[PDB]
Amino acid sequence: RFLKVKNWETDVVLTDTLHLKSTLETGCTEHICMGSIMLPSVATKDQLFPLAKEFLDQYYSSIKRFGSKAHMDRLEEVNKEIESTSTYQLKDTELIYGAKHAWRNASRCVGRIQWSKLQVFDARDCTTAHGMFNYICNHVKYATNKGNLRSAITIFPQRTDGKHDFRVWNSQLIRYAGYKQPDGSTLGDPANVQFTEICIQQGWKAPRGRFDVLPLLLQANGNDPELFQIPPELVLEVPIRHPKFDWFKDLGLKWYGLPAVSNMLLEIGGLEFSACPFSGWYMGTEIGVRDYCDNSRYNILEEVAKKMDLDMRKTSSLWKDQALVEINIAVLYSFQSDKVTIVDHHSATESFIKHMENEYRCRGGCPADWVWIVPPMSGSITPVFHQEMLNYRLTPSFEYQPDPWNTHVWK
Numbered sequence: 412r413f414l415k416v417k418n419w420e421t422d423v424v425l426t427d428t429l430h431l432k433s434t435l436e437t438g439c440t441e442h443i444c445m446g447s448i449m450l451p452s453v454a455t456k457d458q459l460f461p462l463a464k465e466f467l468d469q470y471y472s473s474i475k476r477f478g479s480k481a482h483m484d485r486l487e488e489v490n491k492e493i494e495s496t497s498t499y500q501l502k503d504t505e506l507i508y509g510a511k512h513a514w515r516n517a518s519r520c521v522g523r524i525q526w527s528k529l530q531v532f533d534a535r536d537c538t539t540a541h542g543m544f545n546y547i548c549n550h551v552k553y554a555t556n557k558g559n560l561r562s563a564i565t566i567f568p569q570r571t572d573g574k575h576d577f578r579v580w581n582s583q584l585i586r587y588a589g590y591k592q593p594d595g596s597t598l599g600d601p602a603n604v605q606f607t608e609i610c611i612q613q614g615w616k617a618p619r620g621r622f623d624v625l626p627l628l629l630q631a632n633g634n635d636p637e638l639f640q641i642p643p644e645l646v647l648e649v650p651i652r653h654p655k656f657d658w659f660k661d662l663g664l665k666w667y668g669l670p671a672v673s674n675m676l677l678e679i680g681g682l683e684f685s686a687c688p689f690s691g692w693y694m695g696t697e698i699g700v701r702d703y704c705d706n707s708r709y710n711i712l713e714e715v716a717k718k719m720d721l722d723m724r725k726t727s728s729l730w731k732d733q734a735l736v737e738i739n740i741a742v743l744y745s746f747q748s749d750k751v752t753i754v755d756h757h758s759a760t761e762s763f764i765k766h767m768e769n770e771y772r773c774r775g776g777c778p779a780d781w782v783w784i785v786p787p788m789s790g791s792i793t794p795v796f797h798q799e800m801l802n803y804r805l806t807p808s809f810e811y812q813p814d815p816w817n818t819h820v821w822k
């Protein structure tokens with residue numbers, strides 16, 4: 412009931428009691444484990460006060476004023492507003508606390524050592540998609556900070572009825588376009604081929620190339636979404652060159668500096684923020700391994716093996732592995748030489764072990780998804796591979812949510 416997690420590289424053990432505060436369900440049962448299932452499984456007023464109370468209790472606990480006068484009054488105050496409105500509004504302080512802890516609780520995030528350094532942009536006074544575009548542009552410019560990337564989150568108005576939803580239809584604020592081809596293949600990013608087509612459906616004029624930044628599709632107050640182009644001076648990009656292979660430039664690769672997830676749902680005190688784009692900085696492997704070498708993404712192991720002079724006939728020549736490493740030395744070196752913040756998977760996973768230590772000490776645990784924390788290359792030479800991790804669902808949290816075009820009642 413007060414479980415132990417072991418590290419099998421250092422023999423360090425830590426005791427988790429934080430999982431006791433866990434509320435939501437994981438997908439696993441006593442007889443089945445779903446730890447590798449990617450996305451395992453209107454809100455009313457009865458359900459809403461426990462969530463408000465549970466959240467307010469931990470917020471007031473956090474400012475070292477649990478159960479004080481200000482707490483019990485805000486408790487009463489929010490209850491009265493859940494009577495009056497069948498919902499309620501967060502204080503600016505509560506919104507920042509909730510957002511920061513939604514990140515802190517993100518068990519799939521290897522970057523949470525930074526969780527308390529999050530810039531929260533309150534966009535709950537937004538009303539149109541144009542306002543969203545403007546808030547998002549300010550977010551992009553801020554979080555980029557000329558390459559000295561700064562983590563940030565912009566929080567659009569909370570869901571009310573359900574048919575009035577603020578949504579960023581993009582899965583990330585900055586993604587490259589994906590166009591299928593007349594010969595059945597794909598240019599750009601195959602992940603975004605549907606979304607690239609939805610933008611064309613809503614009128615986007617596509618410069619059908621590779622690294623064509625997509626336009627924002629922003630839905631405000633449940634209205635049909637509208638297209639907006641992020642001013643290209645706001646989209647910082649890193650040309651990928653290798654520090655050894657001067658044929659790397661001829662590959663002609665580049666990636667954007669700002670990883671900014673825009674399709675998830677922020678839950679705070681039972682309130683649901685359907686549009687809450689949030690950004691940090693990249694870990695090299697996200698670009699160099701997944702974005703570039705996933706079979707259904709850019710799929711570049713092909714050419715990088717070629718220009719390196721590698722035996723590609725035999726599977727066991729590990730030509731794939733060898734070209735994969737050069738690609739990630741190149742992503743890293745390109746970002747570093749440009750002063751664009753990036754972290755390598757060794758430094759990032761070392762910090763997460765350190766972060767885990769701090770969480771178990773001053774918090775009693777750290778929910779963690781091994782399947783997602785372990786980097787997608789060189790897993791066992793990073794320390795998180797050898798670290799047992801308990802996964803559980805704390806709130807405030809970031810949740811997945813349906814793609815908007817599957818759910819939206821158009822017009």
Ligand code: HEM
Pocket residue numbers: 510514517519520521522523525529562563564672689690691692693694697754759783809
């Ligand atoms: C500051 C530097 C950060 C680093 C190095 C980092 C690193 C990562 C990485 C590598 C992933 C895996 C993404 C994937 O494999 O698709 C991830 C997931 C995630 N990150 Fe962090 N991140 C950072 C900032 C943030 C911030 C600012 C937030 C929220 C405020 C956040 C919340 C999340 C969430 C919710 C996920 C899992 C959702 C998903 O992508 O499926 N991260 N992070």
Ligand SMILES: CNCc1cncc(-c2cc(C)cc(N)n2)c1
Pocket residue numbers: 522670671672689690691692693694697
């Ligand atoms: C399913 N996850 C989507 C995704 C794709 N690319 C990048 C990220 C990401 C997001 C953030 C905040 C930081 C980071 N270092 N990376 C998330």
Ligand SMILES: C[C@H](O)[C@H](O)[C@H]1CNc2nc(N)[nH]c(=O)c2N1
Pocket residue numbers: 446447448449782783784
């Ligand atoms: C099947 C498996 O759950 C799925 O491929 C997961 C594995 N671990 C991952 N880990 C990260 N960081 N990102 C991912 O997209 C995935 N995909």
Ligand SMILES: [Zn+2]
Pocket residue numbers: 439443444445446
């Ligand atoms: Zn399990």
